[PDB]
Ligand binder design. Sequence first.
Ligand SMILES: CCCCCCCCCCCCCCCCCC(=O)OC[C@H](COP(=O)(O)OCCN)OC(=O)CCCCCCCCCCCCCCCCC
Ligand code: SF4
Lengths: 183, 116, 60, 340, 80, 110, 169, 86, 77, 57
Amino acid sequence: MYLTYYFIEITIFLAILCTIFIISAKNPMVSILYMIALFVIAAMYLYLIGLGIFSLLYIMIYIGAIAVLFLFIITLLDINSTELSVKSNIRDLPLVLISLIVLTISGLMIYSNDSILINKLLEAFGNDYNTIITQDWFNIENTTLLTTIGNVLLTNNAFILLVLAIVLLLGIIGPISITMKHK
Amino acid sequence: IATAFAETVKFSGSKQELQKRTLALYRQFLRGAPTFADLYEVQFSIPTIRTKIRQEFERHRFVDDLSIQNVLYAKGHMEYQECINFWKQQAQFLKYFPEEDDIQGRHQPSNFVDKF
Amino acid sequence: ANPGFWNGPFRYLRWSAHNRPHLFFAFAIGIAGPVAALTLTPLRRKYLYPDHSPLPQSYP
Amino acid sequence: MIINIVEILIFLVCVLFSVAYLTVAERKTLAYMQRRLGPNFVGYYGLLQAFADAVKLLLKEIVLPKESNYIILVISPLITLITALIGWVVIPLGPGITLGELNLGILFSLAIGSLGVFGSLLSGWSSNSKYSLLGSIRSTAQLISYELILTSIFIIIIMFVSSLNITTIIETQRVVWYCIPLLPLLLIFFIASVAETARPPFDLTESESELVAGYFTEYSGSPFVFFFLAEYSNIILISAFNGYLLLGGYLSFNYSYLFNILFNDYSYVSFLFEGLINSSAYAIKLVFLMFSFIWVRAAFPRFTYDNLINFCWIILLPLLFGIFLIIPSTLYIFDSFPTL
Amino acid sequence: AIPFEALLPYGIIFGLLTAGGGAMQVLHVYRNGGVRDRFAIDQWDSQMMERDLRLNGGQGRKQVDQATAPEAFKHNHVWK
Amino acid sequence: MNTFIIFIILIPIVGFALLAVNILLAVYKPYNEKRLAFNAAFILVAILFLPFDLEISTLLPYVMSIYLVSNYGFTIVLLFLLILIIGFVYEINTNALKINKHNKPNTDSL
Amino acid sequence: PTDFPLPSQQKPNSAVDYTLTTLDAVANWARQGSFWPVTFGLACCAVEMMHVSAPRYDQDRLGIIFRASPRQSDIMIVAGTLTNKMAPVLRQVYDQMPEPRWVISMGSCANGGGYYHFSYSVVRGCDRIVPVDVYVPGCPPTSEALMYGVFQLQRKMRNTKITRMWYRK
Amino acid sequence: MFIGTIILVLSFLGFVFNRRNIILAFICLETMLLGINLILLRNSVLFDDISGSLFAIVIIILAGVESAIGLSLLVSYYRLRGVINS
Amino acid sequence: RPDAEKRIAAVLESFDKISNPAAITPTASFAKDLNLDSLDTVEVVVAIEEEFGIEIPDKEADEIKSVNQAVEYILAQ
Amino acid sequence: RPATWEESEEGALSKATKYFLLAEMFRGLYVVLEQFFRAPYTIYYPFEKGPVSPRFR
Ligand SMILES: CCCCCCCCCCCCCCCCCC(=O)OC[C@H](COP(=O)(O)OCCN)OC(=O)CCCCCCCCCCCCCCCCC
Ligand code: SF4
């Protein structure tokens, strides 16, 4: 079954390995250098899961615009960095973060389906074990479409598009009236 | 229509006022010494700079005329002007510092016998 | 030099398109869009119906 | 499995050998345009200069104590990998019917031409010099501001297409020679195309000795040939990309080859010839395009950053938003919309 | 007149992409056999061309030559 | 496999290859000798760059399926472009640098 | 150990060299072909240098395409006279320059001080500052002269014999 | 949905234990908005065509304006562009 | 004020030319008590302002003659 | 002292044409293309030489 091409899906280990870098960097901006590696690993995940379209969307608009803007800021007015995760700055870290990781693992367990027990907490962790989904064959799919249907829904739900027009309006008027400082 | 570090040229009359003015010049010229050691990356220490600045002003302790002390003040404040930023370079800057002995080898012990 | 001034509109559009014309000729396209999009309902004069389709499930 | 790796080696040696001799080509054509002669001495004829220059400037390799080597040893390799080469993953009309690309073409090229910009920005981030990184932020700012009006115009020309896979634009455009004959905003695409890959009449962050006797960083050595090759390869890629969509591939003599191949061959002798003339068509549509780059190198001088942002955010972009206030409008008016 | 030297680099920049196109055309007719190449007709050749692979190679016109319906394929994959 | 994955895998190794040629045989022997400022137009250009990107990301599915929304998707996107173009007519009025020092006032005497 | 075979050998002059003359001449030809400087360009002699960029005696018919950056450079044409004030800047430019480096002294003033040579503010030749490999004589030497010095420098490059000097000839 | 919850939780408690560098906190808060989409997209893939992925393109278009307002507000965490202060 | 002049009588003691630290009464003169030069007076003033990392104006350097004045200006931060 | 108001009648929408598309600038491109065809001036210096007057030094 091409042994590695079945565990090519489990790239989450690279995600957690990048995110453990993302909060303990040396420089303030080698972190946001690693953030685009996080986003391109997310794109690799989405291409692997069956939606390469949103992979290429993330490459176009996150590391194309917003990560570029993080790098754009972090050149000028660079903030005073504490150096790294020193042991005196790793003080009171483990004493709450261990319990918080456990509680949030129980939250991911609380995303499970319907069981009023701790059985659903173990059920989602064994979700891959008893199951491998079965695809089907083409019963009357006339025209080819992947993100065309997204625009069809953007026509049906047109009002949220005309309102996020207003949120992009705010995204341009705000930075005018907060930084230009008219005379 | 500009300056660089506010070089002014106006010589006063009274020798007391020139005394005070050279004194404040000495303070700025002494205060800029860690800025000098930062700027030029010398080998020696900041107290070497300070004792040589003191040496340079003790070179002209006993100069009589205020109308010589004027242009000595101008030379001092003007070389402060050309030292407070990076006009002078370190090759230009080491012309004040006879630092090392080992460049010379054995040399004149200031005896007549060893002129020969 | 003179900018545009509103109060004479036939004059304004002249001394807009002649001193700062580069937004005029943009907005001429911006008015050629929808106004001409409203002068079509006689101009097609019932030209054509596209007639496309997904699967036609019929009736009894 | 063996056929596709020798395919990919042929295509890589084509693009690499291509961009190698392109610099000699542009220097020759500047020289005749500057009423002199270009590299006329190197070895065997005078076609060889860059192919010796590459071996020359490997063997230098300095590093700088003002900067981590770990970023500048990789950031010109970044734009060499992504901006130069894997833009050709889309196989920007690998000039036959076939490609080395599956589908979903144009926005992949968009994504990678977008991906090059912080390859420029992190390059200029280096050395911590207070006069350098502001010039970097200048370069990257004008770079993204003309990325935007590459983007917002080649998404509106595909409004005559609506299909996002690579070929369908090209089979759509053979009826009209759709590319420029229905719309001349090619020229503003062309004047956008000199900016988003700056080999320009702008030269803007190449203030070569206006700064402290260095422009970008002066990362000379293998990063220099990386930056050099990737800039020229971005040029021929975006020039192909112009010749991809808004200039046309598949010249009309292949449409007339119905009146030629039916008078030449009997029945499908290994498809021996048509891919070659199709490649000939796309190549002569591509090099004739970049000949105008080599014009505009030596015709009009540098372009004055404040006026450059004036040229982006004040003039071209509102004309643009007018122009796709009408190209949705006019086809809706005249007859109708395109299918996919 | 024309620059005999200056169009020689344009001649080889022409010829390299020319041979590069011809080689793609040759390697795809040798990949597919003596036919042209299909574009992405998404969701549809994976009905159609996959069905051709379930029956034959290339193409064929007959009634049916299946056996156990020519071994009906069923795709399966891991949960995400 | 086998189609372009070879290209995006071969190319990083070619980049490391032409890098790692001259890391060894170039002579190094490195001898010796080897806050800030601002403007509004150096920052607000890239800030306002981003919304005009992702409205093109908004526009991109509409231009993908321009068909299947006939006579009506045109209307909605015309309203969208109206709501965006008024933001453009806001920002045309202000964004430019200003030369600080150029004075001209008439001179008077007593 | 403790014994020695090594006899009286030739000067660096040979012809029996398998493959090392060929490889060394390829690398040397690559270095000899492109050959770009950085302008330092101080006076009248820089006007003749930019006359070598003029179309009559073109640089680019040889390959000389100079960048304005001391790291991307190979040889450093000192042209014009050289002040006392300049010389530390010149040596600092010289040090930030990669190891296969040469210096052309273009102009009489640049070597042995030239026509001033008796100023308080002039450096009596750049031999007091940077090591030089090819001199170029005379106030302003001809564009002919600068190219002749360039070809003589490339003729020196054709005897660099660096690979067979790794072989210790 | 391990793949999105884990990146969300690590961005979240990175935003908690962030006693250095305000912008790393700011980008951890950014990466929350792509830790959530890996949940949303795979739930939509496990279900259907465009029901939740419409909300996905919404949250992408809006996360842009998030980072835009966050930068253009972080510029004013001080005086403006630059003056004397302390 | 308290033990600021401890630091000052540490710096001036670390400064040379004052062979008797017992001659350094704290509240005492510079040039009368210890025979400090008028050049050396502002020399040790700049030494004092460099020790506390503080910067003084010109008239504040003008008025200093005894260290009680110096401590009284040290008190301004 | 020419007062030279020069308010109106430079052009009648031809001004917007010449400003709008780069006719004055396309002219310069046509000039350098016409210059491209003409003769070069290089002198192959090892093989050829510039003019040497008898009074040259
Ligand atoms: C109507 C029916 C059809 C409907 C569809 C319409 C489609 C039409 C096609 C697109 C329209 C072309 C629009 C061209 C935009 C150029 C506008 C422009 O450049 O404005 C000039 C402006 C001048 O600057 P500024 O001082 O601010 O102006 C104010 C003066 N009071 O800005 C400048 O500073 C000028 C800088 C320009 C730099 C250009 C550099 C050289 C480019 C020449 C190479 C192109 C030639 C090769 C291609 C030609 C192929 C034939
Ligand atoms: S060498 Fe001759 S030409 Fe050059 S600067 Fe000196 S005097 Fe001038």
